[PDB]
Every structure is written in C-alpha cells, then in structure tokens.
C-alpha cells in the first residue's frame, strides 16, 4: 500500500532552570527509525529501527548536526512566540513541528507537509498546493509574511517533492523485510451478556501489520455503522497492532449479525459469526 515518511520535532521550555527539552523523531509509516533526545546520554541521532543501521558514519554525523541545528531554531521559536503572544516566562510552552511526504503504492509523490503548532493548536501549515500557507491568528500572519519574504515554501518544495521521496524509497528498499510485510490479523469473537433483551458481540483482530484495518458490522446484510463502538487501533507491544468492534444484539438474534475484517494481509476479506 501507500507509504509515508514524517519527521516530528518538539521543544518544551522548562521555565527558569533547565534548557528547552528537544526531541526529534523520524517515522516511516507507523514505526520510528531515528530519534534524538536532549536528556539522552548520547546527544546524537540514535537509531531506532534495524534497517537504518546500514547507513555509515557520514550519515549519522550529518543528521546529528542537522538535529542540533533544529534544536536552536526551536529554542529561538520559543522566545519568538512567547513575545508575539505576550506571555509570562514562568509558564511552560510547547512548540511542535512536522514535515514529510506521502507516496502511493507505486512510490510516486502524493503530497507533502510542513506544519507548525504552538501548545497543540494549529499555528501555520503548508497548504496542498505546496505554495501558500494557512495562518489563523495574527502572530501566524507575521510568520506567514516572514516565510513569504524568505521564499520558504519555494525552498521546501525541492525537499518535499524530491529529497523526501528519494530517501523514503531507499528506506523502503533497505528495510523491505520490515516495512513491506503484511501480517494477517488473527481474529476471534466473544459474546458477553450485558442485560436482558440484549447482549453484546465483540469482534477482535490481533497481531496484524500495518495498523490500517477496517472492521465493520453487518446485520444481514447492511452495515450498522451508527450504533457500533470502535476502539482506536492500539499497539500490542511487539510491533503488531490490536483493534476490536462491538455491537449490542437482542438475545436470540446473535446469528443474524456478522463481522467483516478487511486488511492487506488477507487475500479476501474475512467474515465471522457466532
């Protein structure tokens, strides 16, 4: 299926004592591969996935210098955004930044990203056209013009449409045994009594990868998309994912309902009943 590479940056200010805690993580699809942490002992770009360890020291030295560059850019962004919004210095604040690119099944560019947030609220984001920005409040309009005067979006289109796609293709090829696998979900279903005149049926899906899965209930034979509960896909702790879906069924009619699982690791979508 489609693939993506995302880089996440977070610098939280420790008011008074303590320099800003800076964390930088790189992702391919759902798994992290690189990580930097100010509180870590290495002070370098540490590996987090097996396949990137093919890269030599020239890679790790160049990436480490670039992370420490982003560490200072965001250390100034904290002071710049604290003064624009006119805020106290005894209070902590959080700047977040994400840029990356998506590709389809044919590994061709789909869309790129370059977004920013202050304390978890959308600050400025690169639009779909990779040209204009999305600024809501005036402190983001100040940054919008500042990035328009410096031609930021024009300088990033080279990275988003090319450099990002090239490295993602190398990552998908060096780690094809990890990033291109499809573990089929091991499925089962349970029936627990909720009360009289009703009872629930929980459709499970375990030990699958990637996290993209579709679990819909069907009551002979239409979807019950409204009155159904669907937990967020969660990590199992061993690289796979878990998810379930449940419906409340009046007693004696559990056999009329049926669950349907759709996943990349399944040649045809499965179907289970009581």
């Amino acid at each position: 299926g489609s693939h993506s590479m995302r880089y996440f940056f977070t610098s939280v200010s420790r008011p008074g004592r303590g320099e800003p805690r800076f964390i930088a993580v790189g992702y391919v699809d759902d798994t992290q591969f690189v990580r930097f942490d100010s509180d870590a002992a290495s002070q370098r770009m540490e590996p987090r996935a097996p396949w990137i360890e093919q890269e030599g020291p020239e890679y790790w030295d160049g990436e480490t210098r670039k992370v420490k560059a982003h560490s200072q850019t965001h250390r100034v962004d904290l002071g710049t955004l604290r003064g624009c919004y006119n805020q106290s210095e005894a209070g902590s604040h959080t700047v977040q930044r994400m840029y990356g690119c998506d590709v389809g099944s044919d590994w061709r560019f789909l869309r790129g990203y370059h977004q920013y947030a202050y304390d978890g609220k959308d600050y400025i984001a690169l639009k779909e056209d990779l040209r204009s920005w999305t600024a809501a409040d005036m402190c983001a309009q100040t940054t919008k013009h500042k990035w328009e005067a410096a031609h930021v979006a024009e300088q990033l289109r080279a990275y988003l449409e090319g450099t990002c796609v090239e490295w993602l293709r190398r990552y998908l090829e060096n780690g094809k045994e990890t990033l291109q696998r499809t573990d089929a979900p091991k499925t089962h279903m349970t029936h627990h009594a909720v009360s009289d005149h009703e009872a629930t049926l929980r459709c499970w899906a375990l030990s699958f990868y990637p996290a993209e899965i579709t679990l819909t209930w069907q009551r002979d034979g239409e979807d019950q998309t409204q009155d159904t509960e669907l937990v967020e896909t969660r990590p199992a702790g061993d690289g796979t994912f878990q998810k379930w879906a449940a419906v409340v069924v009046p007693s004696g009619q559990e056999q009329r309902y049926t669950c349907h699982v759709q996943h990349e690791g399944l040649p045809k979508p499965l179907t289970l009943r009581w």
Binding site: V34, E63, H70, V95, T163
Partner: peptide, 9 residues
Amino acid sequence: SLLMWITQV
C-alpha cells in the same frame, strides 16, 4: 534525510 535548512518563526 533530515531537512538541512529550517526556518525560524
């Protein structure tokens, strides 16, 4: 892989 030229706010 990482973006070299990052711009401040």
